[PDB]
Design a protein around this ligand. Structure first.
Ligand SMILES: Nc1ncnc2c1ncn2[C@@H]1O[C@H](COP(=O)(O)OP(=O)(O)OP(O)(O)=S)[C@@H](O)[C@H]1O
Ligand SMILES: Nc1ncnc2c1ncn2[C@@H]1O[C@H](COP(=O)(O)OP(=O)(O)OP(O)(O)=S)[C@@H](O)[C@H]1O
Ligand SMILES: Nc1ncnc2c1ncn2[C@@H]1O[C@H](COP(=O)(O)OP(=O)(O)OP(O)(O)=S)[C@@H](O)[C@H]1O
Ligand SMILES: Nc1ncnc2c1ncn2[C@@H]1O[C@H](COP(=O)(O)OP(=O)(O)OP(O)(O)=S)[C@@H](O)[C@H]1O
Ligand SMILES: Nc1ncnc2c1ncn2[C@@H]1O[C@H](COP(=O)(O)OP(=O)(O)O)[C@@H](O)[C@H]1O
Ligand SMILES: Nc1ncnc2c1ncn2[C@@H]1O[C@H](COP(=O)(O)OP(=O)(O)O)[C@@H](O)[C@H]1O
Lengths: 546, 548, 562
């Protein structure tokens, strides 16, 4: 009776009727009471993530106890809690004396007992206090997993997060508490919008609490825009607005200007990547079948690998892909699989486990994808890595998460995966087909999307490349204001001279440099071509004079 | 008695009987009390898997003590337990000093007991131990003990191992039927020997993660608690436990019954639910697998060594994928190893990997390292005709004695696997020259040890509708995220046949050919509009191609 | 009060008589004394493989000091048993172990030079750092403390010789293991302690037999304790047999009982029943091999000699190579032998020499040198033989491996020696090597005894024992062969309750078809299968046959039928 202050009550609140809204999970409450009425491995704990409603689980348990659906050994059982805000070791003895001397009738519920585990171990060894708790999977696995002394008295009970149809009524039961501060109307449309939008896209928090914070920030945004400079009720708009401002991944109804660009991706990308019709069709069909919600929910929103002959665009295409989605090139995650020539370099992209020298440094991939999980990762020269990182990527595909040294889990269900190589480089189709089937096991290539092949450059395809390179050189030497004047004969001359179909486009850059920049840099330092000038070029018998 | 707050007693509470009697395992107690009665290398250590009865044996010895039956040397000597999860950076050695000093000044032979001491061992107990005043009785698991007590120990010269592997079905049944009344008063429902034996056998067979003496008690107590809660049937029975096992694993209560008759009679269209046509082949293979597990064939032979060849794209692999699915409860079990690279004399060592210290050693062989683990697979062999006439010697050794040797030195076992040697021979002959070519190309005596050599019959120009129909029934699940139903029309569905067969690789493309077309041709409607989740999406056969 | 809670008094312990009476080893005690009595750098360190008594010498020195048998400047020195496990243990702060170590050193150097110190297993002296076990190094090289130590060879080399400037202040006393006679002396000295502990008696013949067996069968540990452990084990077993059970002393065969109760070796003095089985061997082995009377006698005589006590203790128990026509029963004779003296057909180590046609494939039964891929795994054969040191090695058809693998057996034989990757050695001294072949193939004994000579070498044929030649299958005895096969089949038909009623003409046609002169009885098991097992399988799953029916067979004009 001397515990009423250091610990609150759930028997008085039961009768006095005030209780947070509880719905569903009745099978879970039945499981809880069934495992409580056992002889061994009784008094379970709750496993999950922030935003399940496990306090709500035990609250519904208490409400059903006070209503009465219990077995014979549960005469209301007066379940209680032990306040962690009750924080020396002398008081705890008398605090636990009431629980011990009880008949197991004032059993307690230690909310978040993860870190409490000296004192309560022998006090539990006799089987007198239930010590029911509520923790998460990471804390179970790092705290109470290896100790065989306590895993004989704890039978975990897993819980299911997404419950959209009941989150509707949950919002119904909590909508009132937010219509008082925010003088706003969150319509049923807003309820079922918060319920059915942020689940697949904002998978960084969890539905029952991310949906509460979504409507909270939406009501705050509405009460904000109410003033002089920004609607009178939350609808299907401010919800999507808050969806956009979280973790960077855009997800709404439609931005009313993005539907056009997406229809025009193939054409828009053809001005930076040239040729590869099959490749552009396949890489375009891959993102449109995702932005619309057609793609599968447990998979990276894009994952394939291509290869072929050199100098064709295997990197330029991925770089243009990073360009057209983030508007800048630096927003791509790029790690080159060339340096991974030994086995033990797995911890370079994973981070060393607790207890070694480089411990707080974190990985190079998982740390860059944990925060801002929408960028595109480029695995340049995947063929070079030790055939053990391929086993990590095996887990990555078709599962969508990986663990690093510290024991946390990050998600990969909204990113794009690009891998490249040049296997064979001389086989037309069957040699390279058998080679890619033989170098990576058929159980890893099974999961992938289409493995693409680039075809190579041709004469008609090189004049446009020359035009692109010349426009680029203009952009470069525009800051000394020496805009170019080049003739179509010289254009075709370059496009013809640099053509050899074994190296691709790199000889064209080499020829452009050695042919123009040579003479241009020779003149620009001897004077007479000073700033604000336009130089012409003309095909000389062998060279091209200026 | 000064710091007895991290220590529990075993004889005091034995003077009350709050322990469980441990009938059975009376050899181990005699072995332990014999070891503990020596002069050097005393204080044994119990080595065995988890939840095997390690704590049960020491408690049984404690109870035999409190009764009094051992030699009077060990008589009148108590035991004290310890919990290490209460001690644990630092001050663990300080409390270790406290407890060791307590034991030391106790000035007697008060035996200790330290569970899973592989976390304790270090150099702080050996000067205490090589003097003869304390007696510690520890316990751990086999591989763990091999880790912490062999490399950094140098102490193994003063520890004696004791082995407790696992009880058997008949023994855990006696254990259960001994430990029944306690629960018949805890809950109190009723108990049946049928339920006990069913729990024992079903746990042993299907709960392949935990072990017997605690695994059985767990299931029994769970079923009893569920049937006490159900009163929200005053007995537990075999079904009353099979339901729990089904809820646990996922496999329903039906298949969790007799596994010979009701299984070998399911060799029916349950295969034909995944394969289409080829009922003759399915019947032949079913008879071969039925008669093979009868119990009269030699105990050293693959469970089947048949092969099937002919036209591709007819579902040659699909038969095997469905076969492994039905038998081993998984279709991700077959392992395909192409006989293409094996066209060179030297490369036959690729599927084994001969020497330790050469290029391919750690990777093992392609065949063995994928068989010694998961010895339930269904190995496939593409284009068996192109493999050099030296791997056939390996195959002979396989299907003449159910074992093989890798390079590491291990022995892989083949007495419960299934071989399947696909091919592509027989391009011109119907049934007359295909067998002659198979006889002439391969060694005509190697084929003798094989089973039926059936050839897959071609697909009826009508019987492509069934395969494409299973395909459509499948792809109907694809757009279940927006509940957009699909249309069917015999002109459209049969339009897939004559334009997707391409009779050099059967229906290889018949998945992509239709999926890309329909999916990516409707994928723009799925963003613009024109459909909602009740629309048949009527697709028609336009004058030339398949528009909507 | 400094070295009062971090140390005991070994001298006072010996004064209280609670130590064991060291016997012998006066050379090493004299060396330790004439080192400990030096002027500067007086610190001996007892070095030697583990188990040979590296501490016993220190207890001996303590006893000698207590008794007063030491030179003038060594009386009343009270050697101290220092320890560091209880100094570095409780300390979680900056500079706290240093205050304790300095207090101990100060308490030593305040008193006169009469606190001779003793740290056991001093390979635990280089740690404690984080400048520890290193401040203690000026005092060492000045003769302030004496610091008698004791460390194993391996730990010494691994932990100290990496710290050369510290190893200089030490002196090594190589404590080699004793021989059998000294071991008998020590055992006879210690007999009374165990005779008092266990209320039994121990015979001198038992002590001698222990000291002799513990040297010939347990070749992984060392003598002065490897022997004592057996005496203790047998005393304890006899005690347990006396108690708890409603001619009370250990004997010289209980020790053999122990040393056979582990390691599997049947070493003993032919207890009863065993002799009956050995005398009844040629016939008992005949029930599984019919014919070859010449060979069974040889192997039987080998086993008889080896277990009767007349055989060279350092050479294998036999190295037979028998060869002959195809399908005569060579591998089957070997398997029947292994089944005889083990009753476990899968407890022998057969290796198929048909695989080693390549040169480099020998590495599987040796290992790999240090610095290569598979090194810590070992060798297959060596690993299989290091445990179970009683198997029956076999070499299936050793004619394929090209003549280089013949240069490992060349010294496996005649010594029972083999050295794997790690540099270890294993003993084949109590195995039966057996290697078949197929030279000849029809030729007479003087046309195959030329094949052996022209294939192998003199250095090889000289190693192995008699080269048994196998006769051809007598056309008569195949009836008994078919009898054996039908018995094995009936044994396979035991989960059900079926029997057979095999008729004499059926058995005759069976022995008549499937014994072609070039391949012997090999095409008989497959014929039995395809003519009985499959016929019954088609006849059991489809009714018309049920368990219990004494199924008869017939001799129908066509292939055999029911
Ligand atoms: N289709 C193309 N469109 C635009 N630029 C291209 C194209 N093909 C090649 N290039 C240019 O040629 C060079 C090749 O770029 P990359 O894509 O990095 O080379 P690659 O095709 O990936 O071959 P490797 O294996 O990486 S050397 C770059 O300077 C590109 O700008
Ligand atoms: N022979 C036996 N007699 C009575 N009870 C037994 C017997 N064997 C097992 N048990 C019971 O089965 C349970 C086994 O659990 P433990 O004793 O913890 O197992 P263990 O041998 O300590 O190995 P771990 O640590 O559990 S993997 C005990 O609670 C016993 O009551
Ligand atoms: N000369 C001896 N006289 C009497 N007993 C001996 C003698 N040599 C060895 N022993 C006994 O043989 C055993 C050897 O044990 P120890 O010498 O203490 O072990 P150790 O020599 O320190 O080897 P390590 O490195 O500690 S495992 C003890 O039981 C000794 O009593
Ligand atoms: N005297 C015999 N007693 C029993 N079985 C025999 C006898 N002679 C031959 N056999 C049988 O003949 C068959 C072949 O015997 P194996 O010894 O295995 O052949 P093999 O001696 O190894 O000949 P190769 O050269 O290796 S093919 C087995 O089924 C034996 O049971
Ligand atoms: N099913 C539900 N319906 C309505 N409100 C709920 C429900 N579950 C929880 N709540 C309320 O929302 C909050 C959720 O937070 P909390 O339960 O602490 O999350 P967690 O379970 O991760 O600890 C609680 O304070 C509770 O009052
Ligand atoms: N009899 C069949 N039953 C079901 N699907 C079949 C059948 N024959 C072919 N298929 C289809 O063809 C696809 C590929 O055929 P597959 O067997 O992989 O090619 P191959 O026979 O050349 O190895 C299967 O995934 C399946 O969709």
């Amino acid at each position: 009776q001397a515990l009423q202050k250091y610990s609150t009550d759930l028997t008085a609140r039961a009768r006095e009727g005030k209780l947070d809204p509880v719905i569903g999970r009745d099978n879970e409450i039945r499981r809880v009471v069934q495992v409580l009425s056992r002889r061994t491995k009784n008094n379970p704990v709750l496993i999950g993530e922030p935003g399940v409603g496990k306090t709500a689980i035990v609250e519904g348990l208490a409400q059903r106890i006070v209503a009465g659906d219990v077995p014979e050994s549960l005469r209301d059982k007066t379940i209680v809690a032990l306040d962690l805000g009750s924080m020396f070791e002398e008081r705890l003895k008398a605090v636990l004396d009431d629980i011990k001397n009880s008949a197991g009738q004032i059993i307690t519920f230690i909310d978040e007992l993860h870190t409490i585990v000296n004192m309560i171990k022998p006090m539990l060894a006799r089987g007198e206090l239930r010590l029911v708790g509520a923790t998460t999977l990471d804390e179970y696995r790092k705290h109470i997993e290896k100790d065989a002394a306590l895993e004989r008295r704890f039978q975990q009970v897993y819980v299911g997060e997404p419950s959209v149809e009941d989150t509707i009524g949950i919002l119904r039961g909590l909508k009132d508490r937010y219509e008082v501060h925010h003088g706003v109307r969150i319509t049923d449309s807003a309820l079922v919008a918060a319920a059915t939008l942020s689940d697949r896209y904002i998978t960084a928090r969890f539905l029952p609490d991310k949906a509460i914070d979504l409507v909270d920030e939406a009501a705050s945004r509405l009460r904000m825009e109410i003033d002089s400079r920004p609607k009178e009720e939350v609808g299907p708009d401010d919800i999507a607005d808050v969806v956009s401002a979280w973790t960077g991944i855009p997800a709404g109804r439609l931005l009313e200007g993005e539907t056009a660009k997406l229809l025009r991706m193939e054409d828009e990308l053809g001005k930076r990547v040239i040729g590869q019709k099959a490749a552009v069709t396949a890489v375009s069909d891959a993102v449109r079948r995702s932005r619309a919600g057609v793609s599968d929910p447990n998979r990276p929103t894009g994952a394939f690998m291509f290869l072929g002959p050199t100098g064709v665009g295997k990197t330029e295409l991925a770089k243009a892909l990073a360009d057209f989605l983030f508007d800048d090139e630096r927003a791509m995650v790029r790690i080159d699989m060339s340096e991974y020539g030994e086995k033990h370099t797995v911890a370079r992209l994973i981070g060393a486990p607790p207890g070694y020298v480089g411990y707080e440094a974190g990985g190079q991939l998982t740390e860059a994808v944990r925060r801002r999980p929408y960028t595109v990762v480029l695995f340049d020269e995947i063929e070079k890595a030790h055939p053990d990182v391929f086993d990590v990527l095996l887990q990555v595909l078709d599962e969508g998460r990986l663990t690093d040294g510290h024991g946390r889990t990050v998600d990969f269900r909204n990113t794009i995966l690009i891998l490249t190589s040049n296997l064979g480089s001389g086989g037309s189709a069957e040699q390279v087909l058998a080679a890619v089937r033989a170098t990576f096991k058929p159980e890893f290539i099974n999961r992938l999307d289409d493995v693409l092949i680039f075809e190579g450059l041709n004469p008609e395809e090189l004049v446009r490349i020359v035009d692109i390179q010349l426009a680029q050189l203009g952009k470069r030497l525009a800051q000394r204001r020496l805009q170019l004047q080049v003739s179509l004969p010289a254009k075709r001359w370059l496009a013809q001279r640099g053509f050899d179909p074994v190296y691709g486009a790199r000889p064209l850059r080499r020829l452009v440099q050695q042919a123009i920049g040579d003479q241009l840099a020779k003149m620009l330092l001897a004077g007479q071509v000073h700033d604000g000038d336009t130089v012409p070029v003309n095909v000389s018998p062998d060279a091209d004079s200026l």
